[PDB]
Structure formats: structure tokens, C-alpha cells
Write a protein that binds this DNA or RNA. Structure first.
Ligand SMILES: [Ca+2]
Ligand SMILES: [Mn+2]
Ligand SMILES: [Mn+2]
Length: 430
DNA sequence: ATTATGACGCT
DNA sequence: AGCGTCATA
């Protein structure tokens, strides 16, 4: 009872941009705004591969991973924007730079953890405490939460969407104890007020809309964020977790979308996150290991302790290209040319990074895939990265992989290469 | 013939 | 270190 940790010590948010690469292209080209549209890379093979889709286009059934030619079958008026191509490959610089815009705004409010190109976690615990003492114990108006959903509400004893949102919010605010500076529900609510402000700032200063989740930890904040996309934010309280989890497929929780999650389902014979509560911590540890078992035992009760890491910049800078089917590299001159292409983009990004961020990478990782291998990567070798020079890096990369050539002829490369990857790692302050 | 990334876990 | 898992546009 009195000693049962409830994992309600923190306020954590996850902010995720809506249809992010699409919004980047729509800002640039006003003709794409408020239209079914998607972002595509390459074009020759089946119209190119879709990597982002506007909500108008999702209404037609267009999804990520779809070939654009196939997407056009569902949505003949689908508009497309192409990823830039430089040095023979897709170049994602525009989206990386747009990401920096958003991350710098978020950093004004709190320490952030960059979790992807389009999302970051925020630990708002301290900011909430500050805002609470500022408020001087006066109630929180619904007007301060104009885009917030309270998950699980309304409930108990209007047929429009916005009507339902306000009803739930009213019920929530009506129940709040604003006299208690330590009530977790109140702390989450103030957290949500700050996130409204953060999200307003992002939209004002970039033109980009986003969604957000506010809860007591990262996993719940991430889950919350997706519940009412686009352009809305969702508060998932500790108390909302039993009902929420009672019909929540296990694969929906971050880190359980793959083999581990499938094993939880198969081994335990369950489907929903809430069903995990019936197992002892030792039982879960027996099946899924010490770390996973403890994590599952607490997570199915809404509790997780993974900190928001103070890290706004990516830890690695990498350049990758596939060479599918018949385009696989079968000559040494081919392999060397593409290593140079990759190394030149890497040099460009590394030099910008050194100037912007006062650091230098010290290790070069080289990875390849060979025709036939189901694995995404076939071989990964590291060497020293001592100078930001594309010609040196590409020569070094070749040196570390050249023994993979099974061909007796050194001019030929066998078996052909279907992927090259160069990654700079192990940064030090400079 | 989704592709281009990027973090973190295991041994 | 090299490999695997899981994740996101
Ligand atoms: Ca997003
Ligand atoms: Mn995202
Ligand atoms: Mn997505």
C-alpha cells in the first residue's frame, strides 16, 4: 500500500511532428498544402518509394512503403514531392535541417532527448513545479488546454468530435485537486498546459504542426501521442492505464513491436498489455530475461523509469545506399566510385557538424551487404577516422572490405554488393 | 526492389 | 568489437 511505488514522480512529454517530411515539403511549396500528397524517394522503380503521407492521402489508403505507382491507383490525384538526390543518392539534408529548427525551439522549454528525426522527449517535472508556484493555487481553465484530450474521458452518466473532447476535458478539470502541489494528476495537467505552449511555439516559428503525449514516463507519453493525431495532444494519467491497457495489443508498446512482443504473446498465451499483470516478476524474468521481465512487470502497471536523456544531437553520422537487384556492384571501379560518393556526403556532413557542434568523430564504421543474404547487414568493420577527407575515408573503407571479394579476378567483385554504408562514430569535444 | 537512417542490447 | 533488434521519415 503506502510503499508501493506508483511511477508518478515525473512529468514526461513526447512531441512528434505530423506527417513530417510532407509538412517540410508543403511549407516550401504552398501548392501542396491541404492536399493528398506524399514524399517519395527515387522514381524509376514503380514511381518511387513513399516515405511520408499527408492525412488527406491516408484517407484514400495511401501508406508508407507503398510504391508511388500503386498509391496513384488508390488516389489518382495524389501529389508527390521527391527527396533530393546528390552524388547519385537520396540526400536527407532538408529534413535534418528542419528537424534542428524544431529541436531548438523545444530546447527553450526543457532538456530534450532527440528520439528520431521528428520527435523528442521532454522531462517537464521541474518546469511544472515552477509553473505551479507561479499559479498560486488557482484552477486551470479549459482555455489553457485548447487541443488536449484526456484519455478515458468522458465517461459515465453530443455527437461531434470536438464536443467529446471538451466534455472529457471538463470532467477532468472538474475533478482536479488544484490545492495539492504534489498531486500527480495536477502535475500532468500543468505539464499539458506547457506542452500546448511548446506546440504553439513550434507552429508559430516553423509552420509545422505536431502532436504530443503527456504522461509519467516515456513509453506512456509515446503511446499517448499517437492516440489523437494529427495536431492534438493527449494526457494519459496513471489512473487511465488499467482501462487503456485492457484492450491494448502488446505490439503497440514501444520495444514490443518485434520478436520480443511476439514471444510474449505466444509464450504467455495473451493478447493485451493488461493481461501481463497476472504474472509474477519472477515469472516474466524467467521467460524474457532479468531486464525485460522487470521492465514488463512495471510497464503493464503503467510504470517505467527510463530517463529522458540530455541529448539533442545524433550520436552518429552515417551514409547508406542499397543497390537492389540488377544494380548490385560487380566491379572494383563501381565499388570504389560509390564509396567515394558516400564518403563525400559524409565529409560534407561531418565538416558542418564540427563547425556547428564543436566535436570530432574518431571512428569510421564500414558495412556492406552481399547478394543472397537475408540480413540487412552482411559485414561490419571499423577503422580509425583521423581526418575529414572523403578520399582518405573511401580508400580506408575499401581497404577494410576488399578481402570480402571472393572473386579470383580483382577487377570483378563477387558476390556483388547490394549495400554500402559509411558511419562516423565515437565523437570527442573539439 | 521500400530505402535511409539511428539508438541500444548481447556476448 | 561485430552482430542483432527495434525504431522512425
Ligand atoms: Ca511523426
Ligand atoms: Mn516520429
Ligand atoms: Mn510514422
Amino acid at each position: 500500500g503506502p510503499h508501493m511505488a506508483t511511477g508518478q514522480d515525473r512529468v514526461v512529454a513526447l512531441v512528434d511532428m505530423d506527417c513530417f517530411f510532407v509538412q517540410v515539403e508543403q511549407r516550401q511549396n504552398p501548392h501542396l498544402r491541404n492536399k493528398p500528397c506524399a514524399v517519395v524517394q527515387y522514381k524509376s522503380w514503380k514511381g518511387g518509394g513513399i516515405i511520408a503521407v499527408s492525412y488527406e492521402a491516408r484517407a484514400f489508403g495511401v501508406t508508407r512503403s507503398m510504391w508511388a505507382d500503386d498509391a496513384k491507383k488508390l488516389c489518382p490525384d495524389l501529389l508527390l514531392a521527391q527527396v533530393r538526390e546528390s552524388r547519385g543518392k537520396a540526400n536527407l539534408t532538408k529534413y535534418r535541417e528542419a528537424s534542428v529548427e524544431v529541436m531548438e525551439i523545444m530546447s527553450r522549454f526543457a532538456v530534450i532527448e532527440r528520439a528520431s528525426i521528428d520527435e523528442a522527449y521532454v522531462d517537464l517535472t521541474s518546469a511544472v513545479q515552477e509553473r505551479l508556484q507561479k499559479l498560486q493555487g488557482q484552477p486551470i481553465s479549459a482555455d489553457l488546454l485548447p487541443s488536449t484530450y484526456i484519455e478515458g474521458l468522458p465517461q459515465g452518466p453530443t455527437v461531434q468530435k470536438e464536443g467529446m473532447r471538451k466534455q472529457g476535458l471538463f470532467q477532468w478539470l472538474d475533478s482536479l485537486q488544484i490545492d495539492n502541489l504534489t498531486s500527480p494528476d495536477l502535475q500532468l495537467t500543468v505539464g499539458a498546459v506547457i506542452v500546448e505552449e511548446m506546440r504553439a511555439a513550434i507552429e508559430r516559428e516553423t509552420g509545422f504542426q505536431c502532436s504530443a503525449g503527456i504522461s509519467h514516463n516515456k513509453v506512456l507519453a509515446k503511446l499517448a501521442c499517437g492516440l489523437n493525431k494529427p495536431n492534438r495532444q493527449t494526457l494519459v494519467s496513471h489512473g487511465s492505464v488499467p482501462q487503456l491497457f485492457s484492450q491494448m495489443p502488446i505490439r503497440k508498446i514501444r520495444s514490443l513491436g518485434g520478436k520480443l512482443g511476439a514471444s510474449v504473446i505466444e509464450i504467455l498465451g495473451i493478447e493485451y498489455m493488461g493481461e501481463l499483470t497476472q504474472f509474477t516478476e519472477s515469472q516474466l524474468q524467467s521467460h524474457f530475461g532479468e531486464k525485460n521481465g522487470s521492465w514488463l512487470y512495471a510497464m503493464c502497471r503503467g510504470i517505467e523509469h527510463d530517463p529522458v536523456k540530455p541529448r539533442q544531437l545524433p550520436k552518429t553520422i552515417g551514409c547508406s545506399k542499397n543497390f537492389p537487384g540488377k544494380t548490385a556492384l560487380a566491379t572494383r571501379e563501381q565499388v570504389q566510385w560509390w564509396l567515394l560518393q558516400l564518403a563525400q556526403e559524409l565529409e560534407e556532413r561531418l565538416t558542418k557538424d564540427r563547425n556547428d557542434n564543436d566535436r570530432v568523430a574518431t571512428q569510421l564504421v564500414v558495412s556492406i551487404r552481399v547478394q543472397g543474404d537475408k540480413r540487412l547487414s552482411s559485414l561490419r568493420r571499423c577503422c580509425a577516422l583521423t581526418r575529414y577527407d572523403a578520399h582518405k575515408m573511401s580508400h580506408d573503407a575499401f581497404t577494410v572490405i576488399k578481402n570480402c571479394n571472393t572473386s579470383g579476378i580483382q577487377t570483378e567483385w563477387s558476390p556483388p554488393l547490394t549495400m554500402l554504408f559509411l558511419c562516423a562514430t565515437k565523437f570527442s569535444a573539439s
